[PDB]
Structures are given as structure tokens and as C-alpha cells.
From a paper:
To explore the ligand-mutant interactions and exclude the possibility that a different ligand orientation causes the switch from antagonist to agonist, we obtained crystal structures of PXRL428V LBD apo and bound to the antagonist SJPYT-331. L428V was chosen because (1) it is potently activated by the three ligands, (2) it is a conservative mutation in which the WT residue (Leu) is biochemically similar to the mutated residue (Val), and (3) L428 shifts away from SRC-1 in the antagonist-bound WT PXR LBD structures. The mutation did not alter the overall protein fold, including the position of α12, as compared to WT PXR LBD. The L428V mutation results in increased hydrophobicity, reduced amino acid sidechain size, and reduced rotameric freedom. Accordingly, the M425-V428-F429 contact surface was slightly compacted compared to the M425-L428-F429 surface. The residues M425, L428, and F429 form a hydrophobic “hot spot” that contacts agonists through moieties such as the 4-methoxy group, and mutations may change the nature of the hot spot due to a combination of factors, including hydrophobicity, orientation, and size.
Residue numbers in the entry:
A (entry chain A): 142 to 178, 195 to 230, 233 to 310, 316 to 432, 445 to 459
B (entry chain B): 142 to 176, 199 to 310, 317 to 431, 445 to 461
The structure:
Amino acid sequence: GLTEEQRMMIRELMDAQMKTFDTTFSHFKNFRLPGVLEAAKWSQVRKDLCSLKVSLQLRGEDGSVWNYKPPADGKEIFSLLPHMADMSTYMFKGIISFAKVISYFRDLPIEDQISLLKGAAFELCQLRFNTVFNAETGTWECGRLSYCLEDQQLLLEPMLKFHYMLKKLQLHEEEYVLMQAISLFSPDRPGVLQHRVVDQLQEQFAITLKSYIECNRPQPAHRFLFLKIMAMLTELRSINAQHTQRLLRIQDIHPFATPLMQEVFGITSLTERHKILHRLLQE
Amino acid sequence: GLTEEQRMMIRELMDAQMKTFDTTFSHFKNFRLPGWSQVRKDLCSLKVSLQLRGEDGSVWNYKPPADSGGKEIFSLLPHMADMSTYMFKGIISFAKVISYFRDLPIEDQISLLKGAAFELCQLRFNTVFNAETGTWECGRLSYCLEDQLLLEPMLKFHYMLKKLQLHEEEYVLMQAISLFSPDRPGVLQHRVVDQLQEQFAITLKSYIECNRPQPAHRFLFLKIMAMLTELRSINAQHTQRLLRIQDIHPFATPLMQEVFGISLTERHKILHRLLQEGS
């Protein structure tokens, strides 16, 4: 099997996930919704928003259903940004709480904790979003909220191909939370000082995930599952880089980022430029 | 053809309709949206889904809830009250610009508008009704009948009236006939209103003979007048059901309360103010 230290490592990550992942989105409230009613910069922004166009569905407690179809391309392209801003911030807060519960993360310097959270916030959210993704319907089922993709041409978008590829691997709850740990403890994040320590921590999470697949799955059929998982994490880091650059382009012509997102994406001393992230980590 | 008085009559009614019917509902804003046994049958009869199209091209759609423990039956009721009040305000302005209605006593103006508010509103709602889709296309707003439904008299009324394929002039004459009803409760000048009603009916009969020679339009004037009698029956039924819902759950706006009864100018203060304001 696995070393008891490896079994305890999974225990802490799973415990962190249970305490910090609102799988039913029950506590996601008070979010903004779309209301009822330089050229090269905008030209790039329109292509950034057209790729991920979704319809919104709100199921009520009484049984009624509200549905929102997105408009066609104008400034209407930023109709869902405040809602997505609230959803990202809500998810980022749960990721921050996830890292705080992990003991290996708490023992790191505060400047390294901010650097790791800044580089892995988007990735750990996509990893959590994949657990509520329905590939048959192309819908992220977030409790009462649902995000369905409007439209082969989808698989061209890397973030859509990522969710379909990751969902097809059919990972366990432990394998997902190990991907989060591996992604969180990335030593090559910008601003990280303790490179050697974070690299050794990442290797331990990777070894445990590699050992978990060997011990808990049929040996010949899942012979390369661990390597497929690492390839998805590499692709997710490429998508994280591309998403950050899109967001900074959208933010440039049309500010929409919340104060917490501004700290994560570098929008205007790590501790003095990331005071919200610093305060959330000190609580 | 038509006498010059009849031609001026249709001209004033059509000009009245154009100035007071917001067919696109573009000036309908600030309205509410969704967040005993016999009363539950009243609301189940008219179950509709709401669609709100935005200027940008987006669509908000609301599918209604299913009956399960009550209270949820009155989700769209707040909105239907805001839509009704907006429609009646245009109905009030419609009557206010007709010369024959201005020259009546203000106590009779309240009485006539109190008895024909629902009828004139349904006649206007029928003009934006799509029988093939079962939807009232109210500009950016759309009200689709959520899926033998003709058992409801108000729904059969809209389908039967749409089949007659009436012109704009025939609709606005029906509004005049319904508005100048002498037997409305509270009307004092019975003979003045009854004489006014007969002139509108004669003009409608004359218009039909001068402009509809086809065999499908045979007995059209008598079918129209029969539809107006049916609409008066539906008006009483709707008033009875509304008061039951208001009894167990008050939902009528202050203007609706005046019309449905929930010294005429003393109880009808807003109606009194609107009739005195300029059009």
C-alpha cells in the first residue's frame, strides 16, 4: 500500500477539501446578475469573450427557473463579468482556506504563501470546477446555479478541451485533491523564495498520487494514469497563463475585477501589495 | 361611404389609440418580477411563462413553478399587477383624449372607466396576441401560455376574437362601445351614454359594410357585438376571482384597488387625479 505518512497526507488534503469546498454552492449568495435591460485593444477583447459564452440558469427554492441567454456581439460583451467576478472571488476564498488548512503550507513563509496562492488560484478553481462539470450536457452544475455552454468547435478552446479531457479520466476525490496540492506547491511560481522546500513538497504529493494510482487501481489498464494527470496539470498551467493575459486585456478597457482578484492578477513588498490576501491568511 | 361625423369619429378614436397605446411597452419600467382550494383553481387556469428581451440582445426567461404547498402560486401576481396598472393608465389616457368622454361629468368618467378597465385592456392585449404561439408579444416582454385549454373563457375569448381578423378601426370602436356603456354601476347620465354608445355601434356597422365585402366577414358586426357581451361576462368572473385572491393574499396596486372596490371621487383619489391632469 502507501506509507502511513502518505495515508496521513491524503487525510489532511481530503479534510481540507471537505472543510473548504462548498460543493453545493449553498453559501454563494449576494452575487451580481446581468440587468434586465484603442480599436485593436477592443478587437482582442471581443475574441477573448466569444470563446467562453455560457447561458445562466437559476433554479429557485419554490421550483421556478430563471434562465439567461447571453447577447450577441458594443459593450454588451461584458454583461456576465460582474457575476463571473463574484463567482471567481467566492471560489478564490475557498481555495485560500484550502491552503491554510494544509500544515505543509502553513509552515511556509507568508511571502511564499502569497506567491503560491497567486500562481495557483485559477488552476485550483478549475480543478474544483471540473468536479461539478457535466460533459454530457456541457454544464457546470453549481448547486442551484448552472452554466451551460452555448454553440468540435468547442474542443478548439483549450479551457473547454481541458475539462472534457480531465472529466474523461474519471478521477477519485483523492486524486483531484492531490492535483490541487501538486499545483499549489509549484516551486517555479513567480516570487517564490523557498524553491528547494516547495519542490520537495511537490515531489512528495506527486509520489503519493503515483503510489495511490498503483495501489488503488487495476495495474495494467491505468499504467499511465499518473503521467496523464501530470500532462493535464502542465496544460492547466498553460491555460492559467493565457487566462491571466485575457483578463488583463479585459480589465484594461473595462475594469471589473474585485479587490481580491486585483491582488491575485497583479492589478493596481508582496505583503504590502497583497494586503487582502495577507489578512485572509492571518485570520 | 361614411358620414363626415362618422369619419371624424373613427379619426378621433384611431388618433386616441396611437397616442395612448405603448404597443412596444418601452415606457413600462420599474415593475416587479418573481424572486383556498377554489383560489388555487383560479391561478392554475392562467399559467404563463415570462420572457424579457434586453436591448443588447440577451434574453431572461422565467418558467413558472408547479403547485406544491401554495404561496408559490402568487409569483407572477406582483408583475401582473404592475402590467395591469400600466395598461389601465393608457386606457385612462385613451378615454381622456376622446371629446365625448371629456364632456361627461367627472363622476360618470370614474364610473365608466371603473367598469371598462379590464375590457378595454383585454381588447388591447388581443391586438398583440399571437394565436399560433399562444404568446402576448408585448415588445421586450413576452407572456407565453405554459403547456382543450379553451375551457378558460378569457383564453377562448382571445382565440375567438383573433380569428375574426379585425382591423385597427374595428378594435378601437369596440373599445368605445365598451367604454360608453350606460348600464355601468354608478353611471348617472344613462341617456347621454346610451346615445353615445349607439352612435359608435352604428359607425362600426357602417364601417364593416363599406370595407369588408368578403363572405368570411358575413355577420361580422353581430359577431363583434356578441364578443363584447361575452367580454362583459368574463369581466365579472375575473373580478370575482381577483377579490378571492386579494382576500387570502392582497396583491392589487392602489389603482387596482380603486377599480375593484377594495362621493365617487373620494374613494377613487388616483383616478380623480389622472382625469384632471392634462393629456
